[PDB]
């Protein structure tokens, strides 16, 4: 496994810690950037670093259309500006009752199944996908078929005939939804965007964007819920931060994102020209991989970065990236994580590992760290 994907419990592995701020490693020829200063520079200075997979404009592959991470300015600048109406603060406030209802249903399922039960299978793996459907406006009756089509086109256990057949039905439903939404836009993700930029944004872009959001906000949030619940059980005096006001909980959630930093790396950058980084020159065309988990344990970011402390004041961590590509789902993640953790200990105040000796089953195969299962009792 690539060294930048190795964890040791909640922490980056020792051999990852042993790599410098900036070193060349092999996957080929690629820089590993691990300091906080150095990572902020690579992620923000889009004047010297491109994210495009090495092909702009009409010549961009269909699989990357609508994926802002493959866009540089000014192409990036246009599409992100055009999606901004779907992420207003009014949007988040209306989604909150819907996230509360989704969280309650999953707690009910856990409470119906009786203890002990798998938190990952019944709670952490179900919420983020239902939340995303609310975001983009999938009908409430189609949530189950939609998630089937969404996972179906990527299930590596399926053949090329099966996955491609499911991928074609996926692109039909969205194009159906967008054209249906375009002809009569109410309030929602598609509706808010086309009512304001209907002439500037194509259905191919709007389809591409909806697909990419499903992929952007699922593995990351489910990972956060599992690791977060286990993080609090291992630091039991910090559960109290989830039993007060919203400021106390929001502060805890943002510390949990930084401490756990579920994604191993952001999109690879390519040097557009010779650029100085940490007293070393990166030649044009060379690749730079960023370790977000090492960046968020950098003791320049904060002393005792390796300790979890949900009462501490937020700091400029890079778990959501930095600069123009900063996670478009950040506010949504903060909201739904606050609703989930808070509701969980409110329904099950006496939550605990079902058996403290059980093995911890870490998710290591996906782009986001997490757990594959977690039996608990209450
Ligand atoms: C635990 C939750 C999440 C984490 C830790 C996370 C992490 C990140 C990171 C590190 C980036 C920067 C990519 C780069 O610079 O290469 C990013 C970008 C992005 N995220 Fe997230 N993400 C999360 C949830 C979500 C959700 C829920 C959504 C959508 C609902 C989302 C949508 C996006 C999009 C579209 C981008 C591309 C932004 C751009 O280039 O303009 N993310 N995310
Ligand atoms: K995913
Ligand atoms: K993983």
Describe the structure.
The chain has 378 residues and is of the alpha+beta class. The protein has one domain (1-378). It is built from 14 helices and 14 strands. The protein has helices at residues 14-17, 36-44, 75-83, 89-113, 119-124, 127-136, 143-152, 160-183, 189-197, 203-216, 219-234, 246-260, 292-295, 330-347, and strands at residues 7-8, 11-12, 22-25, 30-33, 49-50, 117-118, 269-271, 275-277, 280-282, 287-290, 352-353, 361-363, 370-373, 375-377. The strands form five sheets. The protein has a five-stranded mixed β-sheet, covered by helices on one side. Strand 12 and strand 13 form a beta hairpin. The longest helix has 25 residues, at 89-113. It is globular and about 55 Å long. This is Oxidation protein CepF/oxidation protein CepG. GO terms for molecular function: glycosyltransferase activity; heme binding; iron ion binding; monooxygenase activity; oxidoreductase activity, acting on paired donors, with incorporation or reduction of molecular oxygen. Belongs to the cytochrome P450 family. Heme b binds at residues 76, 80, 220, 267, 269, 325, 327.
**Small ligands present:** protoporphyrin IX containing FE, potassium ion
- What about the largest sheet? 5 strands, mixed
Shape: globular
- H/E element string? EEHEEHEHHEHHHHHHHHEEEEHHEEEE
Q: Quick one: how many beta strands?
A: 14
Number of helices: 14
How many distinct domains? 1
Q: Cα-atom Rg, whole angstroms? A: 21 Å
Structural class given helices, strands, pairing?
alpha+beta
Q: What helical percentage do the residues reach?
A: 40-55%
Q: Looking across the biggest beta sheet, what order are the strands in?
A: 3-4-10-7-5
User: In percent, how much strand structure appears in the residues?
Assistant: 5-15%
* End-to-end separation: 37 Å
